[PDB]
Amino acid sequence: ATPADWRSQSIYFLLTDRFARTDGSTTATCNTADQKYCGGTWQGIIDKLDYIQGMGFTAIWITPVTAQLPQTTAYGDAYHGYWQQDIYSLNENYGTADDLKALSSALHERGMYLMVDVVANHMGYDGAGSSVDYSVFKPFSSQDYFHPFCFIQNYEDQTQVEDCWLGDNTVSLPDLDTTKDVVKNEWYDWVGSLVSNYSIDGLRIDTVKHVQKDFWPGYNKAAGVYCIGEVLDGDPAYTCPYQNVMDGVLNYPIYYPLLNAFKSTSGSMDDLYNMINTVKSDCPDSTLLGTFVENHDNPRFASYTNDIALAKNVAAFIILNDGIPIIYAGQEQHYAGGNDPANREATWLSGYPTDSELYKLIASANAIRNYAISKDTGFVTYKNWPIYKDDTTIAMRKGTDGSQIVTILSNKGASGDSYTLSLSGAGYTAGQQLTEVIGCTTVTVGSDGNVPVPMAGGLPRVLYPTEKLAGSKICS
């Protein structure tokens, strides 16, 4: 599927090892500190697609599918998929080639997309760099395919970042020489044939900044589908230029201020408001970035605060921001694990309740986005407009004039006081009825064109014209 096809999608990101077992158990042990395979599979995902689709997601992002190092290392198993050795075999822990094809077709039968995580930068090996037997890597079965052994020490030296190895003396990540034509041609043939064999709709590419830029346009072209890169830098001047070589990047620039804004009642709405406007003007296309606050590489949002109103607000933001919403399996059940491995909790241990507070919030937010998009082909290309901020508030507008979603978010938290925020700049006309589609209340635009927004319980407010909700299942 093209970058234009992907603009309207909403992604549920999951760890294949941690989301669903074939036996559908909600009680099988998964102690994250063990760092071992807990038994999740492609078949388990198929069996829980109703759970995912019930929150209004249109797509899933699964962890890499290639065969891994076999060892249980001092850091555990390759349960995460980022330690590949044989790219022409699948990780049999998750199932067979027929199971991955059955997952692609099950998503396609529901009108959903499959996005698959891939690594081009490195292989994985149990042991120090000097111990590596290059013959285990398929097809890169020789030292000749790899950069000379060194670790990245100076992350300010882009040459060392690209040419030296990640990992450490316990688990080595042998760094492919991605400047060699033979490595380019191998990766390019592989990625086109992966997408083609499994009917994959898009790729998330791990570890983009560690591969030199001239590798990426050939890779994105070979895949023949939307590619969203992991470029791990909060500076849009470093990260946004990668959109010149790849369709999308994960919105790490928005991540840091978005987390800060909602993780405490002290959070800076200024830093978030300012970064939205920097990304909107200085990134090649803000509408092809991936918005998130939670993944398997950072502490979960609930690890910073268990305030459910703050979690509702940050989820509403992720879904209503420019670009593609990405929610990480467990976020919807308020999971609170810290850094790796604590943030790889098994989704099944929740029991997959469809009545949890954040399952319901995400369902409501995805419902108005999915609905608004079905009635407004301009929603996804209208750049999100922050129209208001104060110490505890940010409001933003997105969508074609007369159909705009107007979102008011708060970091007051669940103890927040009850008041009326007189909001200017929403662009609706006096007497217009709006539905607040999270709480299903109506608000009427005033004589002066200001919206009297009811604030209470630190709750997020999402406004849309009541007349435009004709015939939708929202707030029935």
Ligand SMILES: *[C@@H]1O[C@H](CO)[C@@H](O)[C@H](O)[C@H]1NC(C)=O
């Ligand atoms: C796709 O299938 C063909 C077998 O026809 C094979 O030549 C190729 O290696 C496969 N690609 C992947 C990535 O499995």
Ligand SMILES: [Ca+2]
């Ligand atoms: Ca590299």
